[PDB]
Amino acid sequence: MKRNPHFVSLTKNYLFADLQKRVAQFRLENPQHTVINLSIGDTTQPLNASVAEAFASSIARLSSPTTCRGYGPDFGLPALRQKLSEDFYRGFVDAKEIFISDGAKVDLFRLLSFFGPNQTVAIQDPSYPAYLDIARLTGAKEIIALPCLQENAFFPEFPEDTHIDILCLCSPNNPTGTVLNKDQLRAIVHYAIEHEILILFDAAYSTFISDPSLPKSIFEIPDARFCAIEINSFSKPLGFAGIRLGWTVIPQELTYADGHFVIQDWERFLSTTFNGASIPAQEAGVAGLSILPQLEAIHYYRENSDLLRKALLATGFEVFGGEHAPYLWVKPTQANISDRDLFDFFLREYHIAITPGIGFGRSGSGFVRFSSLGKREDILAACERLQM
Amino acid sequence: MKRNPHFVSLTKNYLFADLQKRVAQFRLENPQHTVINLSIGDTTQPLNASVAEAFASSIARLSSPTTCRGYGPDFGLPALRQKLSEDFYRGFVDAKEIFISDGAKVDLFRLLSFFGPNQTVAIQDPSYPAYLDIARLTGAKEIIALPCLQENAFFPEFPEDTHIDILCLCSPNNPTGTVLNKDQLRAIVHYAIEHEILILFDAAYSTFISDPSLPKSIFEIPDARFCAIEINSFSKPLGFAGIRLGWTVIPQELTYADGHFVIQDWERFLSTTFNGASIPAQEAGVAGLSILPQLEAIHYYRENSDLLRKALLATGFEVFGGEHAPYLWVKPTQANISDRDLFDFFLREYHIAITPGIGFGRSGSGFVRFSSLGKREDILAACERLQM
């Protein structure tokens, strides 16, 4: 066997692994300098109680002799496909267009592998680092970075006459924490149809959206069904620890250049390469959809975000995002801390670990990403250090 | 987007779907002719009780605030990797060589996609139909069918000076129900090393092996670590309904032509494209490994198989396999029932649905596959019809 060449292009980093070992390093050499890590995370948040109950009840069902498979589909439990259609998508998407998977990282990889090698793929800049790697691994001819800058309300800057096959969009965005609004999405969809671009719309942070005016799905947007696919899943920090579940939406209307429907090939691809999500995870998901309006956890984290924003602004920082996603995209203004300086700057001046914007790509230059997903104690501490 | 060409090569069938609709059809037009379906299946068999208990206990743990991620790896729960190493592989495989996934269909697809397009892949003939499809979908240059015939004790007939990159092996085999013994595997491994072939060894039926002399893993075979990967998982019919779990074994020693280690690239590939198996499924797996020696279910099905074999032989049928797998590979002898005749022949003469051998490939000609995975009532009925 020869080595895979699609493979040799990789180096990734890993951005967060390296930042983590560096935080550990700093902790070694600064034992009395207590560090509030906002560069990532908080796990520890437990599986929601009613979700867990449903999961166990499904297990109890599986162990009794009836029973019952249930091999799915394949495409998912009808009850989950239907509940996603109705409650999650507010009727914008039909049950038959929803394909249940075990999560949004696998799905992106399945989708990019489904579309094949030699595609040119555009991604927002700053970029979700996972995307570039999957793009390279699935054999992209080129990756085109699309500057999203606050001066443009984060609308991606499309390159003049450059061929794009796939546009990956993450909204709410990692790292900017911003959301493309209805007007912005309408223009992007119009742009995509005009240039024969397929949109992969990653909406995994959509539960974080906090004004009901904003779109939650790209299928709220005129003409999206002729050029877009959505991927989504439950947010672990919101209480889905242990639930391996996601979904992909393929509109009935979406076609290849020759008029073949994407959905028919996707169905065949999935059947050939995939066994379905587990029955208990799916039944847990049905119960998850029910408590999604409730969720005290979302409120807890929006509080974290508001707490952070105020401190940051009061210290003369410029703050973007954080309203509709668990990230704040933060610009000093300035003391001209260079890109290679930023991480040490925040550690040394505030004992706060962040992720420097530049690790996310060139348009991250000058910025830092704050994670809102942490204990209230750590957030409050962080606000003290900034208030000094 | 243009259509995927790797895709347009597909037609598969589906062999079992078509056979099923035909059994339903026959049931329509023959209401008083009761049909014993041995062409597939029996699901309904419930999740093992101690496995279910472990699963629920993991859920209870996830819902309590500690807690605790647990993102894995990535490569799997240390307790499961270690228990597979020690109990499942009897020490033949180290924990660090075992990569936990959500199942053996996904893993085959991951592996073939990991090795890349344009490979030439050899598969046993008669073939596990799923393999050909994944091979085509991942971009194989050619698929080479390897006749496995009873005259040769089912040893695959390798083609004279023909370039092979990957050899897929399924042992115990679907559809022949036979097992390649230590001597046969030793020769295949020697052949593979000499021709620079990588073996993908699918051992998903290995729990069915009933003499402790036979190898259960290819890593019992001299020199296998220089040319082989194993894939495996729990058998659903044995009591793992609802458990989305498999594993891949990459030996530390395995290298590409240039001397790079496969295991290092596999680790990177998996991290980039995969989030891990669910924690509850893995903890359930640990408990599954414990009861694997016990398993009344294996005994139940071996009984089914012995029952079938006797009836078949007493009716002058030639029977192969069935000792170490839940399939019997059966030859009339003859009444010269053509290949297109066989399914109707068994339905009409015995009210037994089987899968004709020819659906599995050219070397299936003249044979029929019996499934041993059914209720004792249906097996006994089937034996009556054959005893006439």
PDB file of N, CA, C and O in Angstrom, chain A residues 188-243:
ATOM      1  N   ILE A 188     -26.646  35.505  -0.203  1.00  0.00           N
ATOM      2  CA  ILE A 188     -25.700  34.389  -0.384  1.00  0.00           C
ATOM      3  C   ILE A 188     -26.323  33.281  -1.233  1.00  0.00           C
ATOM      4  O   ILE A 188     -25.688  32.748  -2.156  1.00  0.00           O
ATOM      5  N   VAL A 189     -27.583  32.963  -0.952  1.00  0.00           N
ATOM      6  CA  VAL A 189     -28.296  31.971  -1.767  1.00  0.00           C
ATOM      7  C   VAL A 189     -28.407  32.428  -3.228  1.00  0.00           C
ATOM      8  O   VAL A 189     -28.185  31.653  -4.156  1.00  0.00           O
ATOM      9  N   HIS A 190     -28.742  33.693  -3.432  1.00  0.00           N
ATOM     10  CA  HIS A 190     -28.844  34.223  -4.792  1.00  0.00           C
ATOM     11  C   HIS A 190     -27.487  34.125  -5.488  1.00  0.00           C
ATOM     12  O   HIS A 190     -27.387  33.683  -6.651  1.00  0.00           O
ATOM     13  N   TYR A 191     -26.429  34.491  -4.758  1.00  0.00           N
ATOM     14  CA  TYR A 191     -25.063  34.365  -5.276  1.00  0.00           C
ATOM     15  C   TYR A 191     -24.709  32.924  -5.668  1.00  0.00           C
ATOM     16  O   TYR A 191     -24.171  32.671  -6.763  1.00  0.00           O
ATOM     17  N   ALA A 192     -25.033  31.986  -4.780  1.00  0.00           N
ATOM     18  CA  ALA A 192     -24.793  30.555  -5.004  1.00  0.00           C
ATOM     19  C   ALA A 192     -25.519  29.979  -6.229  1.00  0.00           C
ATOM     20  O   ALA A 192     -24.935  29.222  -7.018  1.00  0.00           O
ATOM     21  N   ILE A 193     -26.796  30.325  -6.385  1.00  0.00           N
ATOM     22  CA  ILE A 193     -27.553  29.863  -7.562  1.00  0.00           C
ATOM     23  C   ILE A 193     -26.932  30.405  -8.860  1.00  0.00           C
ATOM     24  O   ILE A 193     -26.668  29.642  -9.787  1.00  0.00           O
ATOM     25  N   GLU A 194     -26.668  31.707  -8.893  1.00  0.00           N
ATOM     26  CA  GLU A 194     -25.987  32.349 -10.027  1.00  0.00           C
ATOM     27  C   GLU A 194     -24.629  31.725 -10.371  1.00  0.00           C
ATOM     28  O   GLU A 194     -24.266  31.654 -11.538  1.00  0.00           O
ATOM     29  N   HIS A 195     -23.883  31.259  -9.372  1.00  0.00           N
ATOM     30  CA  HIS A 195     -22.568  30.683  -9.662  1.00  0.00           C
ATOM     31  C   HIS A 195     -22.507  29.168  -9.583  1.00  0.00           C
ATOM     32  O   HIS A 195     -21.419  28.597  -9.605  1.00  0.00           O
ATOM     33  N   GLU A 196     -23.667  28.515  -9.535  1.00  0.00           N
ATOM     34  CA  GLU A 196     -23.725  27.054  -9.466  1.00  0.00           C
ATOM     35  C   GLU A 196     -22.966  26.507  -8.246  1.00  0.00           C
ATOM     36  O   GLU A 196     -22.270  25.488  -8.352  1.00  0.00           O
ATOM     37  N   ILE A 197     -23.103  27.181  -7.105  1.00  0.00           N
ATOM     38  CA  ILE A 197     -22.441  26.762  -5.866  1.00  0.00           C
ATOM     39  C   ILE A 197     -23.430  25.984  -5.001  1.00  0.00           C
ATOM     40  O   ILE A 197     -24.589  26.373  -4.875  1.00  0.00           O
ATOM     41  N   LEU A 198     -22.954  24.903  -4.393  1.00  0.00           N
ATOM     42  CA  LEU A 198     -23.717  24.168  -3.383  1.00  0.00           C
ATOM     43  C   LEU A 198     -23.321  24.652  -1.994  1.00  0.00           C
ATOM     44  O   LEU A 198     -22.113  24.729  -1.670  1.00  0.00           O
ATOM     45  N   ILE A 199     -24.312  24.994  -1.174  1.00  0.00           N
ATOM     46  CA  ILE A 199     -24.034  25.465   0.179  1.00  0.00           C
ATOM     47  C   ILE A 199     -24.146  24.320   1.167  1.00  0.00           C
ATOM     48  O   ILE A 199     -25.125  23.597   1.150  1.00  0.00           O
ATOM     49  N   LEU A 200     -23.131  24.146   2.020  1.00  0.00           N
ATOM     50  CA  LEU A 200     -23.282  23.267   3.193  1.00  0.00           C
ATOM     51  C   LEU A 200     -23.444  24.165   4.401  1.00  0.00           C
ATOM     52  O   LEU A 200     -22.506  24.880   4.797  1.00  0.00           O
ATOM     53  N   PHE A 201     -24.642  24.151   4.974  1.00  0.00           N
ATOM     54  CA  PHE A 201     -25.015  25.105   6.008  1.00  0.00           C
ATOM     55  C   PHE A 201     -24.962  24.409   7.356  1.00  0.00           C
ATOM     56  O   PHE A 201     -25.784  23.531   7.652  1.00  0.00           O
ATOM     57  N   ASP A 202     -23.945  24.752   8.154  1.00  0.00           N
ATOM     58  CA  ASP A 202     -23.777  24.092   9.460  1.00  0.00           C
ATOM     59  C   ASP A 202     -24.455  24.920  10.524  1.00  0.00           C
ATOM     60  O   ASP A 202     -23.984  26.003  10.868  1.00  0.00           O
ATOM     61  N   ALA A 203     -25.544  24.390  11.071  1.00  0.00           N
ATOM     62  CA  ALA A 203     -26.398  25.151  11.964  1.00  0.00           C
ATOM     63  C   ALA A 203     -26.358  24.573  13.372  1.00  0.00           C
ATOM     64  O   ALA A 203     -27.255  24.807  14.179  1.00  0.00           O
ATOM     65  N   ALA A 204     -25.257  23.871  13.688  1.00  0.00           N
ATOM     66  CA  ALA A 204     -25.118  23.231  14.985  1.00  0.00           C
ATOM     67  C   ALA A 204     -25.253  24.185  16.177  1.00  0.00           C
ATOM     68  O   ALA A 204     -25.668  23.737  17.244  1.00  0.00           O
ATOM     69  N   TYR A 205     -24.977  25.487  16.019  1.00  0.00           N
ATOM     70  CA  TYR A 205     -25.209  26.421  17.147  1.00  0.00           C
ATOM     71  C   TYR A 205     -26.582  27.108  17.187  1.00  0.00           C
ATOM     72  O   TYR A 205     -26.799  28.031  17.984  1.00  0.00           O
ATOM     73  N   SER A 206     -27.519  26.653  16.355  1.00  0.00           N
ATOM     74  CA  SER A 206     -28.794  27.387  16.176  1.00  0.00           C
ATOM     75  C   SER A 206     -29.674  27.523  17.419  1.00  0.00           C
ATOM     76  O   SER A 206     -30.353  28.524  17.577  1.00  0.00           O
ATOM     77  N   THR A 207     -29.645  26.537  18.312  1.00  0.00           N
ATOM     78  CA  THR A 207     -30.313  26.639  19.619  1.00  0.00           C
ATOM     79  C   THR A 207     -29.890  27.883  20.425  1.00  0.00           C
ATOM     80  O   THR A 207     -30.658  28.363  21.266  1.00  0.00           O
ATOM     81  N   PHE A 208     -28.688  28.410  20.166  1.00  0.00           N
ATOM     82  CA  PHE A 208     -28.198  29.598  20.893  1.00  0.00           C
ATOM     83  C   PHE A 208     -28.813  30.915  20.440  1.00  0.00           C
ATOM     84  O   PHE A 208     -28.716  31.934  21.155  1.00  0.00           O
ATOM     85  N   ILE A 209     -29.438  30.912  19.261  1.00  0.00           N
ATOM     86  CA  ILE A 209     -30.068  32.123  18.735  1.00  0.00           C
ATOM     87  C   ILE A 209     -31.123  32.615  19.725  1.00  0.00           C
ATOM     88  O   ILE A 209     -31.936  31.842  20.223  1.00  0.00           O
ATOM     89  N   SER A 210     -31.092  33.902  20.022  1.00  0.00           N
ATOM     90  CA  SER A 210     -31.977  34.448  21.049  1.00  0.00           C
ATOM     91  C   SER A 210     -32.942  35.549  20.577  1.00  0.00           C
ATOM     92  O   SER A 210     -33.741  36.045  21.370  1.00  0.00           O
ATOM     93  N   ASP A 211     -32.883  35.972  19.323  1.00  0.00           N
ATOM     94  CA  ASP A 211     -34.072  36.674  18.833  1.00  0.00           C
ATOM     95  C   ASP A 211     -34.811  35.904  17.757  1.00  0.00           C
ATOM     96  O   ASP A 211     -34.209  35.436  16.778  1.00  0.00           O
ATOM     97  N   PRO A 212     -36.128  35.768  17.954  1.00  0.00           N
ATOM     98  CA  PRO A 212     -36.942  34.912  17.102  1.00  0.00           C
ATOM     99  C   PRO A 212     -37.103  35.451  15.680  1.00  0.00           C
ATOM    100  O   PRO A 212     -37.642  34.746  14.849  1.00  0.00           O
ATOM    101  N   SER A 213     -36.605  36.657  15.396  1.00  0.00           N
ATOM    102  CA  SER A 213     -36.587  37.223  14.041  1.00  0.00           C
ATOM    103  C   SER A 213     -35.563  36.598  13.130  1.00  0.00           C
ATOM    104  O   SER A 213     -35.785  36.482  11.920  1.00  0.00           O
ATOM    105  N   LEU A 214     -34.412  36.251  13.701  1.00  0.00           N
ATOM    106  CA  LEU A 214     -33.322  35.690  12.921  1.00  0.00           C
ATOM    107  C   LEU A 214     -33.720  34.332  12.354  1.00  0.00           C
ATOM    108  O   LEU A 214     -34.484  33.616  12.987  1.00  0.00           O
ATOM    109  N   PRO A 215     -33.188  33.965  11.171  1.00  0.00           N
ATOM    110  CA  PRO A 215     -33.464  32.585  10.718  1.00  0.00           C
ATOM    111  C   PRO A 215     -32.690  31.569  11.558  1.00  0.00           C
ATOM    112  O   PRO A 215     -31.566  31.856  12.001  1.00  0.00           O
ATOM    113  N   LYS A 216     -33.280  30.395  11.763  1.00  0.00           N
ATOM    114  CA  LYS A 216     -32.594  29.303  12.460  1.00  0.00           C
ATOM    115  C   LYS A 216     -32.082  28.255  11.458  1.00  0.00           C
ATOM    116  O   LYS A 216     -31.057  27.593  11.686  1.00  0.00           O
ATOM    117  N   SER A 217     -32.792  28.121  10.337  1.00  0.00           N
ATOM    118  CA  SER A 217     -32.410  27.182   9.279  1.00  0.00           C
ATOM    119  C   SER A 217     -32.248  27.938   7.967  1.00  0.00           C
ATOM    120  O   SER A 217     -32.976  28.905   7.708  1.00  0.00           O
ATOM    121  N   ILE A 218     -31.332  27.490   7.114  1.00  0.00           N
ATOM    122  CA  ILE A 218     -31.260  28.099   5.788  1.00  0.00           C
ATOM    123  C   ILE A 218     -32.538  27.857   4.934  1.00  0.00           C
ATOM    124  O   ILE A 218     -32.782  28.569   3.961  1.00  0.00           O
ATOM    125  N   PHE A 219     -33.360  26.895   5.343  1.00  0.00           N
ATOM    126  CA  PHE A 219     -34.601  26.594   4.620  1.00  0.00           C
ATOM    127  C   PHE A 219     -35.756  27.535   4.938  1.00  0.00           C
ATOM    128  O   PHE A 219     -36.883  27.330   4.507  1.00  0.00           O
ATOM    129  N   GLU A 220     -35.444  28.571   5.708  1.00  0.00           N
ATOM    130  CA  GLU A 220     -36.297  29.747   5.861  1.00  0.00           C
ATOM    131  C   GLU A 220     -36.051  30.802   4.767  1.00  0.00           C
ATOM    132  O   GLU A 220     -36.748  31.828   4.708  1.00  0.00           O
ATOM    133  N   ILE A 221     -35.094  30.541   3.891  1.00  0.00           N
ATOM    134  CA  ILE A 221     -34.614  31.540   2.952  1.00  0.00           C
ATOM    135  C   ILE A 221     -35.085  31.199   1.535  1.00  0.00           C
ATOM    136  O   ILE A 221     -34.957  30.056   1.123  1.00  0.00           O
ATOM    137  N   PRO A 222     -35.651  32.195   0.799  1.00  0.00           N
ATOM    138  CA  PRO A 222     -36.157  31.973  -0.570  1.00  0.00           C
ATOM    139  C   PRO A 222     -35.075  31.368  -1.408  1.00  0.00           C
ATOM    140  O   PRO A 222     -33.910  31.818  -1.323  1.00  0.00           O
ATOM    141  N   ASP A 223     -35.438  30.324  -2.153  1.00  0.00           N
ATOM    142  CA  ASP A 223     -34.553  29.673  -3.108  1.00  0.00           C
ATOM    143  C   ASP A 223     -33.447  28.755  -2.501  1.00  0.00           C
ATOM    144  O   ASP A 223     -32.678  28.160  -3.249  1.00  0.00           O
ATOM    145  N   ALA A 224     -33.387  28.630  -1.177  1.00  0.00           N
ATOM    146  CA  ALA A 224     -32.352  27.771  -0.542  1.00  0.00           C
ATOM    147  C   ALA A 224     -32.432  26.292  -0.948  1.00  0.00           C
ATOM    148  O   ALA A 224     -31.404  25.608  -1.025  1.00  0.00           O
ATOM    149  N   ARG A 225     -33.642  25.804  -1.239  1.00  0.00           N
ATOM    150  CA  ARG A 225     -33.833  24.403  -1.601  1.00  0.00           C
ATOM    151  C   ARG A 225     -33.238  24.039  -2.955  1.00  0.00           C
ATOM    152  O   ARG A 225     -33.097  22.852  -3.277  1.00  0.00           O
ATOM    153  N   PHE A 226     -32.848  25.047  -3.736  1.00  0.00           N
ATOM    154  CA  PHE A 226     -32.198  24.785  -5.010  1.00  0.00           C
ATOM    155  C   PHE A 226     -30.673  24.811  -4.921  1.00  0.00           C
ATOM    156  O   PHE A 226     -29.974  24.598  -5.930  1.00  0.00           O
ATOM    157  N   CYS A 227     -30.142  25.077  -3.733  1.00  0.00           N
ATOM    158  CA  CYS A 227     -28.680  25.129  -3.616  1.00  0.00           C
ATOM    159  C   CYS A 227     -28.080  24.770  -2.263  1.00  0.00           C
ATOM    160  O   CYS A 227     -26.876  24.912  -2.103  1.00  0.00           O
ATOM    161  N   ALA A 228     -28.876  24.338  -1.291  1.00  0.00           N
ATOM    162  CA  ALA A 228     -28.337  24.157   0.076  1.00  0.00           C
ATOM    163  C   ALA A 228     -28.671  22.812   0.733  1.00  0.00           C
ATOM    164  O   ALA A 228     -29.687  22.174   0.433  1.00  0.00           O
ATOM    165  N   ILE A 229     -27.776  22.402   1.623  1.00  0.00           N
ATOM    166  CA  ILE A 229     -27.957  21.267   2.522  1.00  0.00           C
ATOM    167  C   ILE A 229     -27.676  21.803   3.920  1.00  0.00           C
ATOM    168  O   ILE A 229     -26.804  22.645   4.089  1.00  0.00           O
ATOM    169  N   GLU A 230     -28.417  21.352   4.919  1.00  0.00           N
ATOM    170  CA  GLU A 230     -28.115  21.738   6.287  1.00  0.00           C
ATOM    171  C   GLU A 230     -27.595  20.542   7.098  1.00  0.00           C
ATOM    172  O   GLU A 230     -28.059  19.402   6.925  1.00  0.00           O
ATOM    173  N   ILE A 231     -26.651  20.813   7.999  1.00  0.00           N
ATOM    174  CA  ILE A 231     -26.275  19.826   9.006  1.00  0.00           C
ATOM    175  C   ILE A 231     -26.491  20.416  10.367  1.00  0.00           C
ATOM    176  O   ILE A 231     -26.349  21.626  10.561  1.00  0.00           O
ATOM    177  N   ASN A 232     -26.887  19.572  11.305  1.00  0.00           N
ATOM    178  CA  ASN A 232     -27.236  20.052  12.645  1.00  0.00           C
ATOM    179  C   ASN A 232     -27.103  18.887  13.623  1.00  0.00           C
ATOM    180  O   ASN A 232     -26.836  17.760  13.210  1.00  0.00           O
ATOM    181  N   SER A 233     -27.277  19.160  14.912  1.00  0.00           N
ATOM    182  CA  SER A 233     -27.241  18.119  15.957  1.00  0.00           C
ATOM    183  C   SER A 233     -27.534  18.799  17.274  1.00  0.00           C
ATOM    184  O   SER A 233     -27.621  20.024  17.326  1.00  0.00           O
ATOM    185  N   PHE A 234     -27.668  18.016  18.340  1.00  0.00           N
ATOM    186  CA  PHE A 234     -27.812  18.598  19.679  1.00  0.00           C
ATOM    187  C   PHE A 234     -26.494  19.122  20.233  1.00  0.00           C
ATOM    188  O   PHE A 234     -25.432  18.553  19.986  1.00  0.00           O
ATOM    189  N   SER A 235     -26.572  20.213  20.986  1.00  0.00           N
ATOM    190  CA  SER A 235     -25.389  20.788  21.615  1.00  0.00           C
ATOM    191  C   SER A 235     -25.091  20.100  22.963  1.00  0.00           C
ATOM    192  O   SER A 235     -25.873  20.235  23.911  1.00  0.00           O
ATOM    193  N   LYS A 236     -23.964  19.387  23.043  1.00  0.00           N
ATOM    194  CA  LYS A 236     -23.563  18.667  24.274  1.00  0.00           C
ATOM    195  C   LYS A 236     -23.624  19.528  25.544  1.00  0.00           C
ATOM    196  O   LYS A 236     -24.199  19.098  26.549  1.00  0.00           O
ATOM    197  N   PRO A 237     -23.019  20.741  25.509  1.00  0.00           N
ATOM    198  CA  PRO A 237     -22.997  21.594  26.703  1.00  0.00           C
ATOM    199  C   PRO A 237     -24.391  21.944  27.211  1.00  0.00           C
ATOM    200  O   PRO A 237     -24.558  22.256  28.387  1.00  0.00           O
ATOM    201  N   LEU A 238     -25.379  21.885  26.323  1.00  0.00           N
ATOM    202  CA  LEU A 238     -26.755  22.171  26.687  1.00  0.00           C
ATOM    203  C   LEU A 238     -27.426  20.988  27.377  1.00  0.00           C
ATOM    204  O   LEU A 238     -28.543  21.120  27.862  1.00  0.00           O
ATOM    205  N   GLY A 239     -26.755  19.839  27.418  1.00  0.00           N
ATOM    206  CA  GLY A 239     -27.240  18.703  28.201  1.00  0.00           C
ATOM    207  C   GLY A 239     -27.433  17.423  27.417  1.00  0.00           C
ATOM    208  O   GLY A 239     -28.372  16.669  27.680  1.00  0.00           O
ATOM    209  N   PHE A 240     -26.543  17.167  26.461  1.00  0.00           N
ATOM    210  CA  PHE A 240     -26.674  15.988  25.617  1.00  0.00           C
ATOM    211  C   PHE A 240     -25.444  15.104  25.669  1.00  0.00           C
ATOM    212  O   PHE A 240     -25.196  14.308  24.755  1.00  0.00           O
ATOM    213  N   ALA A 241     -24.693  15.247  26.761  1.00  0.00           N
ATOM    214  CA  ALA A 241     -23.548  14.397  27.040  1.00  0.00           C
ATOM    215  C   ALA A 241     -23.972  12.962  26.870  1.00  0.00           C
ATOM    216  O   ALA A 241     -24.930  12.524  27.517  1.00  0.00           O
ATOM    217  N   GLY A 242     -23.279  12.243  25.986  1.00  0.00           N
ATOM    218  CA  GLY A 242     -23.512  10.807  25.793  1.00  0.00           C
ATOM    219  C   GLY A 242     -24.462  10.468  24.651  1.00  0.00           C
ATOM    220  O   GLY A 242     -24.687   9.292  24.351  1.00  0.00           O
ATOM    221  N   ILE A 243     -25.032  11.495  24.031  1.00  0.00           N
ATOM    222  CA  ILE A 243     -25.947  11.311  22.903  1.00  0.00           C
ATOM    223  C   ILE A 243     -25.216  11.501  21.546  1.00  0.00           C
ATOM    224  O   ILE A 243     -24.879  12.617  21.164  1.00  0.00           O
TER     225      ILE A 243
END
